[PDB]
Design a protein around this ligand. Structure first.
Ligand SMILES: Cc1cccc2cccc(N3CCc4c(nc(OC[C@@H]5CCCN5C)nc4N4CCNC[C@H]4C)C3)c12
Ligand SMILES: Nc1nc2c(ncn2[C@@H]2O[C@H](COP(=O)(O)OP(=O)(O)O)[C@@H](O)[C@H]2O)c(=O)[nH]1
Ligand SMILES: [Mg+2]
Length: 168
């Protein structure tokens, strides 16, 4: 089977952990320790390919040490997550994409832009705004809810698909 190393990044509170746990463990966590960073592995079939997904759920403090830089650059693809009711988290996307380009030392890194919490009633980030940002980057965009599980499998599988085509 093919191993894929995925890294879920984005501002605190956007739902990186809920998204990962929903995909790995099939349940919605409401109060996952905001500081716990860990890797999770899941065997799954994507487009008929058996895949082992190694998924780094990032957390902790905004540090830029050489060890963290090294942990991140093992990512083959990146889920860049913001929440549709958190303007600041959307604005922060550019920064995360810049940090990815830096530690990977490349301007084409497989990435998917993810607008989480789409179950929530009053969003301040419009679908169009985020699509526009995605198309500027050349990356896919998907809306997700870690609560209802909408889009969750597709967000991760779509990232896997972006890694395949980068590998040609
Ligand atoms: C994420 C990432 C990807 C690829 C390579 C990296 C290399 C080094 C460090 C990384 N990370 C570490 C965690 C982190 C990072 N950048 C911000 O930016 C917060 C705000 C907004 C813009 C500037 N800054 C002021 N915040 C963070 N953390 C806030 C507190 N909890 C967890 C975490 C989300 C950057 C790399
Ligand atoms: N309503 C709703 N709440 C969510 C969703 N995803 C995460 N949350 C909640 O938002 C908070 C932060 O989620 P968490 O996964 O810890 O964010 P992280 O800092 O990105 O890991 C928690 O209270 C979650 O229960 C979602 O899709 N919808
Ligand atoms: Mg978390």
């Amino acid at each position: 089977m093919t191993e894929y190393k995925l890294v879920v990044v984005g501002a605190d509170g956007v739902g990186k952990s809920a998204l990962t746990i929903q995909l790995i463990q099939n349940h919605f966590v409401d109060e996952y320790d905001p500081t716990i960073e860990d890797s999770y592995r899941k065997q799954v079939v994507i487009d008929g390919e058996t895949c082992l997904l190694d998924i780094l759920d990032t957390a902790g403090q905004e540090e830029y040490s050489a060890m963290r830089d090294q942990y991140m650059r093992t990512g083959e693809g990146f889920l860049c997550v913001f929440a549709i009711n958190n303007t600041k988290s959307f604005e922060d996307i550019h920064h995360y994409r810049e940090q990815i380009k830096r530690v990977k030392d490349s301007e084409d890194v497989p990435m998917v832009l993810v607008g989480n919490k789409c179950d929530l009633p009053s969003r301040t980030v419009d679908t169009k705004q985020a699509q526009d940002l995605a198309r500027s980057y050349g990356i896919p965009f998907i809306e997700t809810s870690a609560k209802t599980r909408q889009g969750v499998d597709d967000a991760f599988y779509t990232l896997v698909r972006e890694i395949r085509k980068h590998k040609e």
